[PDB]
Amino acid sequence: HHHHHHMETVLRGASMFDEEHAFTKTLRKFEELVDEKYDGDVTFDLRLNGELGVESDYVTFLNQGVAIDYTILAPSNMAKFAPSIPLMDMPFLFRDLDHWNAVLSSDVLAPLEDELLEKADIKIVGYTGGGTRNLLSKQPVVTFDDLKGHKMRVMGAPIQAQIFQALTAAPSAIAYNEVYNAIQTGVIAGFENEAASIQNLKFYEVAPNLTLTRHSITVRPIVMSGKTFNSLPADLQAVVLEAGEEAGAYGRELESREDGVKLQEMVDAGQLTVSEFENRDKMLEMVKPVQDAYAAEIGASDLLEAVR
Ligand SMILES: O=C(O)[C@H]1O[C@H](O)[C@@H](O)[C@@H](O)[C@H]1O
Numbered sequence: 184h185h186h187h188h189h190m191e192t193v194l195r196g197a198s199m200f201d202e203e204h205a206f207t208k209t210l211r212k213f214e215e216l217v218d219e220k221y222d223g224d225v226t227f228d229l230r231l232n233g234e235l236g237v238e239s240d241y242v243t244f245l246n247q248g249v250a251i252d253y254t255i256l257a258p259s260n261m262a263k264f265a266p267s268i269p270l271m272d273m274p275f276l277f278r279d280l281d282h283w284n285a286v287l288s289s290d291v292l293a294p295l296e297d298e299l300l301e302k303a304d305i306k307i308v309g310y311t312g313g314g315t316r317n318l319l320s321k322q323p324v325v326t327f328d329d330l331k332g333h334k335m336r337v338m339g340a341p342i343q344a345q346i347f348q349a350l351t352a353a354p355s356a357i358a359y360n361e362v363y364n365a366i367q368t369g370v371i372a373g374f375e376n377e378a379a380s381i382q383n384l385k386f387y388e389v390a391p392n393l394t395l396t397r398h399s400i401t402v403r404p405i406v407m408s409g410k411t412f413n414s415l416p417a418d419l420q421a422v423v424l425e426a427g428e429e430a431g432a433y434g435r436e437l438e439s440r441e442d443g444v445k446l447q448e449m450v451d452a453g454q455l456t457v458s459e460f461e462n463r464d465k466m467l468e469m470v471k472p473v474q475d476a477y478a479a480e481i482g483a484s485d486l487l488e489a490v491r
Contacts, residue, residue, distance in 0.1 A: 189414040189415055189416065191224050191225065191226045192224065192225045192226065192415075192419075193225075193226045193227075193228060194225060194226070194227050194228070194252040194253060194411070195227075195228050195229075195230065195250070195251045195252050195253075196210050196214075196227060196228065196229040196230065196251060196252065196253045196254055197229070197230050197234075197235040197236070197241050197244075197251045197253075197254045198210055198229060198230070198231050198232075198233075198254065198255070199232075199233040199237055199238070199359075199384075200231065200232070200233075200380070200383050200384070201231060201232055201383065202231065203383060204379055204380070204383040205311070205314075205379050205434055205437050205438040205441065206255045206311065206403070206434070207229070207231060208433075208434065208437065209255065209311045209405065209430050209431070209433065209434030209437075210229055210253070210254070210255065210405075210430075211229070212429075212430040212433045212434065213253070213308075213309075213405060213426055213427060213430035214227040214229065216425070216426035216429055216430055217419075217422055217423060217426045220422045220425060220426055221418070221419055221422045222418070223416075223418070223419060225419070230251075233360065235250070235251060236360075237358065237359045237360050238254075238256050238257060238260040238359065239260055239339070239358065239359070241254045241256060242256055242260060242261050242263070242264060242303075242305070243264075244408075245303075245304075245305045245406060245407070245408040245409075246264050246303050246304055246305060246408075247408075247410075248304065248408045248409070248410025248411060251408075252407055252408055252411040253308075253405070253406060253407040253408075253411075254405075254406060255311055255403050255404065255405050255406065256305075256403070256404060256406050257272075257338060257401070257403060258270070258271040258272050258273075258340070258402060258404070259272075259273070259337075259338035259339070259340035259342065259343050260338050260339065260340070261299070261303065261305070261340075262339060262340035262341065262342075263339070264299075264302065264303035264305070265295075265298055265299045265302045265303045265305075266341075266481060267295055267298050267481040267483060268295050268298065268299050269340035269341075269342045269343070269477075270295060270342075270477070270478060270481065270483055270486070270487065271292055271295050271402050271404075272312070272399060272400065272401055272402035273342045273343075273346070273399075273474065273477070274316075274342070274343070274346040274347075274398045274399050274470065275346070275398055275399075275466065275467060275470045275474065276399075276474070276490060276491075277399075277400045279400075280313070280400065280439060283313070283400045283402070286402075286490060287310050287402065287431075287435070291486070291489060291490065292402075294483075294486060295486075299404075300409055303409075304408065304409035304410060305406050305407075305408060305409055306406065306407045306408070306409050306412040306413075307404040307405070307406055307427075308404075308405050308406065308407050308412070308423055308424055308426075308427030308428075309404070309405040309424075309426075309427030309428045309429070309430055309431030309432075310402060310403065310404055310405065310431040310435065311403045311404075311405055311430070311431045311433075311434030311435050311438065312400070312401035312402045312403035312434070312435050312438065313400065313401060313434075313435040313436075313437075313438040313439030313442070314377025314378060314379055314380070314400070314401045314438050314439070314442050315377055315378070315397050315399070315400055315401075315442050316375050316376055316377045316396075316397075316398055316399035316400075316401065317375060317376075317377070317393050317394060317395055317396050317397060317398070318335070318373055318374075318375050318393065318394040318396050318398075318460075319373055319374060319375065319376055319381060319386060319387075319390045319392070319393050319394075320333075320335075320372050320373030320390050320392045320393075320394065321366060321369075321372055321373060321389070321390055321391075321392065322372065322392060323392045323394070323456070323458055324372070324373065324392065324394050324460075325394055325458045325459070325460055325461055326460070326461045326462075327351065327461070327462065327465075330350055330351055330352055331351040331352075332351070332352070332353050333351075333352040333353060333372055333373070334352075334353045334355060334370075334371045334372045334373075335347060335352055335353070335354055335355065335371055335372060335373045335374055335375065336354070336355055336356070336357040336362050336365065336371050336373075336374035336375075337354040337355065337356055337374075337375070338356070338359075339356045341477070342473070342474075342477050343356075344356065345473045345476075345477065346398075346470055346473055346474075349469050349470055349472070349473045350466060350469060350470070355371055357370075357371065362374050362386070363384070363385075363386060363388075363389055366386075366389045366390050367389040373390050373392075374386075374390070375396070375398065375399075377399075377401060377438075377442060378441070378442045378443070378445040378446045378449070379438055379441060379442065379445055381393075381445075381449070381455075382445050382448065382449055387449055387454040387455050388454075391454065391455055391456055392455075392456050392458065393446070393455050393456065393457045393458065394458050394459075394460050395457065395458065395459050395460060395463070396460050396463060396466070397463075398466070401438075403434075403435075405427050405430060405431055405434075407423065407427075474487070475487070
């Protein structure tokens, strides 16, 4: 029972997925690297398979500085606590993987890290991600006529609903752990997600039709509560940042390399039908005003212009 006050230091982690998903692998890598680097003793207890909830639960736990110490979070699942952070990977921000890489390789997102720590008391310790989010639906959704009034789940950050509303869909902010049933019972027609999570959680079972809208390339901060991070001894803080950086690099090389491979696995297995979206590039035009407006609202117009 008895731990070190800031025998061992115990850091609790959470993942929504099993051991086969890139996020869980990234968190394992993080734990491995802290152990390698820290001339000291630390114990990690990673709770998998969504045993501790989903990201909307995790972010409140980290803000409170209890329950869990570290995890990975989507920017658009953190909007309640830091309204600017969804800019980090909002839909249609990145042109392609090269663009996305040029961002994560810089320190250009620093202002958003700073806001998250100041407003939400959550410390970014590295970046994973690299999945490409596409529409996944019960029936094919392949034209703007199909998309008009298309009922779909979005994450809760305002920008997600605003983007898909601009594309003429009917977005709904439904909990991630309720999506499968909401589709299966016809409440919504689909959602949007990247290959690795679709495969790992078997969302193809209810939504077999994937449309290549390629509307987000994920940026997924590895996060520790500010309360825990700031409590750690100074040498361990520095190790956590180095470990986090390297683990993020590992995770995003991994997920980005596997994304197309996993789409093909699901096609080959007869689990997904993959379709292009007709006149997809018209989406870029339609989405600009919403993007510009959001950046202006949060006072990040200069930061957005840079990224583009
Ligand atoms: O849509 C979600 O809430 C989740 O989708 C995937 O599992 C991940 O990208 C996760 O971070 C979150 O975005």
